[PDB]
Amino acid sequence: MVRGQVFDVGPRYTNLSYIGEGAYGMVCSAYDNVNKVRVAIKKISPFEHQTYCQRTLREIKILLRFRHENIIGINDIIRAPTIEQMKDVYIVQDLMETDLYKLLKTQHLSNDHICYFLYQILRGLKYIHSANVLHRDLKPSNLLLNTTCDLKICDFDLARVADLTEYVATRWYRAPEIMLNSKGYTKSIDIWSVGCILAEMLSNRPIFPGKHYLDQLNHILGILGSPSQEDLNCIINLKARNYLLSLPHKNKVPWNRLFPNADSKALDLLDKMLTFNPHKRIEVEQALAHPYLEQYYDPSDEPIAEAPFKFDMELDDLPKEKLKELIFEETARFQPG
Structure with a gap:
């Protein structure tokens, strides 16, 4: 009908x-x-x-x-x-009234909104990760808004418990770990995605808009600069590891040269979130305590899962x-x- x-x-x-x-x-x-x-x-x-x-x-x-x-x-x-x-x-x-994707494409966003929106994403994500759950597909279209600027995370279709080759609308918000097929990715992949979202809230445009697979890394390495061998720590594809080292040495572009009108505090957090090395990437609990979010930070009003998650059986085998x-x-x- x-x-x-x-x-x-x-x-x-x-x-x-x-x-x-x-x-x-x-x-x-x-x-x-x-x-x-x-x-x-x-x-x-x-x-x-x-x-x-x-x-x-x-x-x-x-x-x-x-x-x-x-x-x-x-x-x-x-x-x-x-x-x-x-x-x-x-x-x-x-x-919900709208989403962050609809909002960012049409209208300009003030610093206080960017700060408030960022706090809610991390607050929600805190509950997620405390439940030992990875959203794995965070993006502006997965962040719904209402009249009173309340934010809610959605679409947990690609979610799993922290311990693919399918189709997706966009790969712009995926961490390099996923791009490099790093089996054993952790909570750090969600942080990276929120980092990309933060950046997009500031400039009203995608931070890493790659046309395809290899082009995604070119935008990332173009801004962050080339990675060291220590950054290449995890069990990744040998060829991908070699290919990365074979690429021309790119220089790191300062965040303020990309985001001149952006708040220096926001750029500081943005840096910590968008680090190439997964282990050196900031955690959600530490990201909330960041000075940029001090206006909204409140550990007493930030619930967590009473107990971490675990499915009865492995659904991949059934x-x-x-x-x-x-x-x-x-x-x-x-x-x-």
Whole structure:
């Protein structure tokens, strides 16, 4: 009934209106007749591909467990009664006004907003990482905003527990570790992404807008300068390691030459976040205590996960059918009754 595709969210959710696409697939805005508000609903049909089952079930479990002001929550999950009948899954979330991607492309951002937005991202991320969870795909389009400048992290489809070759809308916000296929990436990849986002909030333009795979590193090395052999510490691709050393020695561009009107405090933190070496990269807890965020910093009003995360089984090994059963049992909560 919407854009040709069927949307069986009624009778609770009515007044449908198309928003955009996934991630998983079609997303629409509907009026919740129960809670008397408008909500966002994602339609998911993951039962064909095996990876889609992983990403769907992983996001469900994580988000249902999480409970934070700066993280989107799942209000409801609509699916068919029986398991064979269930071919689609509908996730209901709070309808946010806009995102950081829409905002940055059109309108200029003041320092106080940039500072406030940065604090909320890290505050939310703190809760994430404290739960030993990696978002892995942070970006301006994954940061939703409302009327009162409240920020919420979204789209945990590519998330996992801290211990790929799939398609993505953008690779501009990925750490060099991912680019260099460094098996054993940690929480530092999220920090890098927030760094790229900080930079984009300042200049209203992407900091590392590479056209493709190799071009991404050229923009990074162009600004940060060439890396040492010590930076090449982790078990990375031997050829990629050699290729990096074979490239011409580029010089580091001072941040104030890139961001002249930017606050010196913000640039200081920006530096610590966008360091090539993953281990030398600042941690979220230390990033919040940074002088730039002292106006909002408050350890007493920054909740964490009561206990770190751990899934019962490894979903990477389970087949397409057992994952459906796992999804079926995880969504059993919202079924009446």
